[PDB]
Amino acid sequence: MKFYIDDLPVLFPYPKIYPEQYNYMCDIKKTLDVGGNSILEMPSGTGKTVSLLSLTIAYQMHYPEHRKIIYCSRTMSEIEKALVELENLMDYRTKELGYQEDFRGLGLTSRKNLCLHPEVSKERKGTVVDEKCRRMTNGQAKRKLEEDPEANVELCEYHENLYNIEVEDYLPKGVFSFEKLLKYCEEKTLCPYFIVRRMISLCNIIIYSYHYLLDPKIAERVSNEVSKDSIVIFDEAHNIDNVCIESLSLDLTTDALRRATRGANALDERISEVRKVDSQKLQDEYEKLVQGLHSADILTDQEEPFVETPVLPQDLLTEAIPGNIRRAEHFVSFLKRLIEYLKTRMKVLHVISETPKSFLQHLKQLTFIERKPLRFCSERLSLLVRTLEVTEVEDFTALKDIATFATLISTYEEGFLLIIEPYEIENAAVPNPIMRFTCLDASIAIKPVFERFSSVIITSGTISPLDMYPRMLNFKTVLQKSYAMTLAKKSFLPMIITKGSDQVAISSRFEIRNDPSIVRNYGSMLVEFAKITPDGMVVFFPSYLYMESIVSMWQTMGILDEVWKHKLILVETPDAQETSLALETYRKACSNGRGAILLSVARGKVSEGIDFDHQYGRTVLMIGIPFQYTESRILKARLEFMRENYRIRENDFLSFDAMRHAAQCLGRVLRGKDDYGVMVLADRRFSRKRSQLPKWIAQGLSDADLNLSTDMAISNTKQFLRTMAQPTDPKDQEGVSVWSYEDLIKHQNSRKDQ
Amino acid sequence: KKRTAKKNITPYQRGIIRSLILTLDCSEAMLEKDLRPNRHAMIIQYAIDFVHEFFDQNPISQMGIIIMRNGLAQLVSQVSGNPQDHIDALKSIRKQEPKGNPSLQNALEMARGLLLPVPAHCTREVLIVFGSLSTTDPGDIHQTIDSLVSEKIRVKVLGLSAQVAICKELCKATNYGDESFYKILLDETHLKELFNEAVTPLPVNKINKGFTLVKMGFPTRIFEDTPTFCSCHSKLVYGGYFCPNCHSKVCSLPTVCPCCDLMLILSTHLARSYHHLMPLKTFAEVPTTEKFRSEDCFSCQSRFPXXXXXXXXXXXXXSRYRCEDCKQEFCVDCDVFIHEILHNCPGCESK
Numbered sequence A: 001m002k003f004y005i006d007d008l009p010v011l012f013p014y015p016k017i018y019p020e021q022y023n024y025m026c027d028i029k030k031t032l033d034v035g036g037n038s039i040l041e042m043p044s045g046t047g048k049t050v051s052l053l054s055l056t057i058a059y060q061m062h063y064p065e066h067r068k069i070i071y072c073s074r075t076m077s078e079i080e081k082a083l084v085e086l087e088n089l090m091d092y093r094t095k096e097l098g099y100q101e102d103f104r105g106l107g108l109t110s111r112k113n114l115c116l117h118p119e120v121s122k123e124r125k126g127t128v129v130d131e132k133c134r135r136m137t138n139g140q141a142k143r144k145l146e147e148d149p150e151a152n153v154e155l156c157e158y159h160e161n162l163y164n165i166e167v168e169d170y171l172p173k174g175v176f177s178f179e180k181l182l183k184y185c186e187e188k189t190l191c192p193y194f195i196v197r198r199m200i201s202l203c204n205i206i207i208y209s210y211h212y213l214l215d216p217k218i219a220e221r222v223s224n225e226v227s228k229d230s231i232v233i234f235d236e237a238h239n240i241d242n243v244c245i246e247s248l249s250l251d252l253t254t255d256a257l258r259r260a261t262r263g264a265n266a267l268d269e270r271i272s273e274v275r276k277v278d279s280q281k282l283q284d285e286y287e288k289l290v291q292g293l294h295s296a297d298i299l300t301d302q303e304e305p306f307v308e309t310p311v312l313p314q315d316l317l318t319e320a321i322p323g324n325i326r327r328a329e330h331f332v333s334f335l336k337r338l339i340e341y342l343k344t345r346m347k348v349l350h351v352i353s354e355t356p357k358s359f360l361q362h363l364k365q366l367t368f369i370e371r372k373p374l375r376f377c378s379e380r381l382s383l384l385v386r387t388l389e390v391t392e393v394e395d396f397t398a399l400k401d402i403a404t405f406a407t408l409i410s411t412y413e414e415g416f417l418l419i420i421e422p423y424e425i426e427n428a429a430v431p432n433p434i435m436r437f438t439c440l441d442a443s444i445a446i447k448p449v450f451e452r453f454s455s456v457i458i459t460s461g462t463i464s465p466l467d468m469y470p471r472m473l474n475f476k477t478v479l480q481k482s483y484a485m486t487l488a489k490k491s492f493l494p495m496i497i498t499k500g501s502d503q504v505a506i507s508s509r510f511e512i513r514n515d516p517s518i519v520r521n522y523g524s525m526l527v528e529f530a531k532i533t534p535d536g537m538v539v540f541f542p543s544y545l546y547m548e549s550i551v552s553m554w555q556t557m558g559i560l561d562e563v564w565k566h567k568l569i570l571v572e573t574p575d576a577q578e579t580s581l582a583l584e585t586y587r588k589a590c591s592n593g594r595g596a597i598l599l600s601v602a603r604g605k606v607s608e609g610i611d612f613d614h615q616y617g618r619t620v621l622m623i624g625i626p627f628q629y630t631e632s633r634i635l636k637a638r639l640e641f642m643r644e645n646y647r648i649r650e651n652d653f654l655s656f657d658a659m660r661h662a663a664q665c666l667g668r669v670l671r672g673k674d675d676y677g678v679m680v681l682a683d684r685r686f687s688r689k690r691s692q693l694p695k696w697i698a699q700g701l702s703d704a705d706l707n708l709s710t711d712m713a714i715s716n717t718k719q720f721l722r723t724m725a726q727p728t729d730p731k732d733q734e735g736v737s738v739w740s741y742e743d744l745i746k747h748q749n750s751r752k753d754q
Numbered sequence B: 001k002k003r004t005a006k007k008n009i010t011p012y013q014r015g016i017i018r019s020l021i022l023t024l025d026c027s028e029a030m031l032e033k034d035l036r037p038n039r040h041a042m043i044i045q046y047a048i049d050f051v052h053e054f055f056d057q058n059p060i061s062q063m064g065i066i067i068m069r070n071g072l073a074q075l076v077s078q079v080s081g082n083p084q085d086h087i088d089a090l091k092s093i094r095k096q097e098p099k100g101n102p103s104l105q106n107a108l109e110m111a112r113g114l115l116l117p118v119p120a121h122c123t124r125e126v127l128i129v130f131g132s133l134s135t136t137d138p139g140d141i142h143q144t145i146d147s148l149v150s151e152k153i154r155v156k157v158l159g160l161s162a163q164v165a166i167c168k169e170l171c172k173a174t175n176y177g178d179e180s181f182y183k184i185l186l187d188e189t190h191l192k193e194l195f196n197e198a199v200t201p202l203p204v205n206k207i208n209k210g211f212t213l214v215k216m217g218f219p220t221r222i223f224e225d226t227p228t229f230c231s232c233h234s235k236l237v238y239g240g241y242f243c244p245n246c247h248s249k250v251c252s253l254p255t256v257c258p259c260c261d262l263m264l265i266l267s268t269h270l271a272r273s274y275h276h277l278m279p280l281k282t283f284a285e286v287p288t289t290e291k292f293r294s295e296d297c298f299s300c301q302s303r304f305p306x307x308x309x310x311x312x313x314x315x316x317x318x319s320r321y322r323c324e325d326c327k328q329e330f331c332v333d334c335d336v337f338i339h340e341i342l343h344n345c346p347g348c349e350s351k
């Protein structure tokens, strides 16, 4: 297609469209012309990706003002799906128009997923990979290597070829997705990490995780070019406040405090050996403190900066000396002040939560140490570490964490909350004290990014209500519309199984353990699907520990045996790699003959980044509802601040976020308008909150689908899939709900200009 | 109110000499209580129906039959050109009962082994019949699919009330990409119609492969009655056919020669194929008030068609579905029976 929105040609890579898509493009452009936030709903059943990217390229190429676009996905996988998607958009755009592209838009995740060095790649923990690519390609490594040629120092050499060819120019022309980017860089034996990091100043669009825009320790290197007048989208931004309050989170436990004693004693050792051997450069750095924050080499560090910035992007900062801490030995002294004051705060008999300032004044009474010097903990630590040109960091992971800790607590107040639980009750009456601390206001963390940028776009495949977020994140929006799925055919049966066979009102909220009434209820429901359902079926659970009790006692039942006769079980497991291997094997089996089943937490990690086609997804089941106050009171005080700050009480938000995770896991099954399947919920409570379910989803919920029995539901899906396999394709009824190529869009809309 | 094939493409070349192999699944799946007697016995029933249907309409083709049970697949009929072998095989099966589950791979591979001696003019198609929700493979699947469609064998499958996209993908492979062959059902009338269309030779947009001649001759009926003697069953044959060159006696059959191995039919079978060579333009229902033809049927004589305005009823179906190239009438039963049994358009044959 090459059509218009009255102002811009649109090179839609599909001859086909859906009317909802034109609704989407119209309202999103109407926004962009007046740059704003304008919370919206776009169903993932249609791939809004293409709508987004097509309109964005049209707008950026067409209007000459915003040459830069920001598209924040949640995860790297969303990014790469969008990457190949945009690649198709770009190839079609070239095919239709010849070559007008001159276009370079790239994503970036980390060395952990991008370290082309093999030895580093064989490691598993991303922190050690980060430090190791540092050391391997360090602004220091190169020097001591070059004045002193020795086998002590090495490099990926990927940074070398980067320096050589890459850092004068850019990639040839391509939108090199992780596939294409990694292939091409390997063919050029390059370091894709540093490639994108340097490339940042030229890409016409950019993509990355939310975190790179959210964690100021990494959301720091943003340039104005990438910031000033870019255009910013968020997709699947529904589960964002988790990331916000996580980015402003810090829990503790004193085994790390022993590790930090180890590190800080080691720092006593390093200061001793260097100062005896030479303190002269240390005094050079003393005068470098005396001149101030030392941006001369505290920020002018092409590879040096050791400790990243837990604080918001340098906004909550000053530049003076930390007073007496000019002496690095005074520095280590106050390091111990901290660590072991933390230790004395570590073993309270019971739980205690702290405001930063309350405990802060407490500490001053206990130990008269001061906030403004205290903030300089992290930066002073990093600079001293560099001046020690250190060879190891593992002893000092705790030290950088505590730097982060002290910096935030000395920095942030009256929005956050320290809390000190002397154990995990989950293994109560044992020592596992926790000095957890975190924020409570996501709008705070977001506010800098809103402040920089006007033309911000929020869109998730779950968002409801479109007002909760304006409350929580306290922001202005304009066009808050939800797009009801215009379809002339059912194509999805959500149903609320409140009644099992025995019609027992069901839930997991009774408890985290067994009650063979509901147990066999759910076993019967499961196995009856297991027979009737074809390949591809995953049900989601409130909690891994709850699902674990249930699954163990169901292995105790024969309830596993019949599904083992028919289909393939896949279960969830805490290990990321083996979870993923289960995932891919599931996919291969279901696309193959033998049907495969996964089952999982609505909070589960796959439900974050993995979508489901027709094959892998047919029948999803939300057993109970994803609540959490099984777990701790951090959410209790979270709600406390909520109520005293937001006009939202506990149950309201518990329901809100539980149904958020619900619809979040729901959305996967659907790919395109040849997509379909089952959606079942299994608990009583889903009737009251029928209206909190997103627009199209609620449309698929007729009240006649409420509190069905499980046997009638078995019948429902029986006839449902009987229909679904059938090619009821009049294609004369598809024009109105697909708006066939170049005409029904043109016809209706150019007429619909009424 | 019509649901009609708009373009009945048939004037070309369909698959005539089809080496058809129905495959059966006799598993615990075929037991289950969703069909009136069962899936299983009903399937045996409609399979017998298809034996008769096929060997009638494709009276020059061959067949072997295979079932699947207990994670294993089981042939029930050698490649046979006598229907009754298949018929009594099906009988012998119906009384045997299903067990276990289908080892789809083994059935595919057994069929693969079977249709190899089929020459070019003899074409290769298998016929799945599926009602299970899973398979049991011992050999790599898409491996064998590659082998299969690399050896030019499209397959038509008839699954029960589900969908299994491996079936659609494998068919699309076997059917040169284009797919219509994963027909599954929702009703038993639906089931038999599925069969009846499975009977006909199947074109899509043919890959222009080798068009090879086929040579044969024709035998002749015998005269002596007492002279009973046979060379195809070695039994008593009171009178029958006589190979055109090998001049052996053959008990009544359209088979290939059992001495010099050449095909033997009379002509009738060619004529059935021709009935499948140029089928006709569909009888268009004449426009309601603009038709105004003679008020009866031509092919038959059916004076009913309208009541001349009863506001609603007569203004409904001015039913004069009359031919296209001949424009000569034929009533609804006449249209159905012409197009069904004797396509034989007399009005078009008339001139």
Ligand code: SF4
Binding pocket: A111, A114, A115, A116, A117, A120, A133, A134, A136, A137, A155, A156, A157, A158, A159, A190, A191, A192, A193, A194
């Ligand atoms: S950026 Fe270069 S040095 Fe660092 S991990 Fe990647 S390949 Fe290795």
Ligand SMILES: [Zn+2]
Binding pocket: B230, B231, B232, B233, B234, B235, B237, B250, B251
């Ligand atoms: Zn004989």
Ligand SMILES: [Zn+2]
Binding pocket: B243, B245, B246, B247, B257, B258, B259, B260, B261, B262
């Ligand atoms: Zn002969």
Ligand SMILES: [Zn+2]
Binding pocket: B297, B298, B299, B300, B301, B302, B330, B331, B332, B333, B334, B335
């Ligand atoms: Zn008639």
Ligand SMILES: [Zn+2]
Binding pocket: B323, B324, B325, B326, B327, B328, B345, B346, B347, B348, B349
């Ligand atoms: Zn005619």
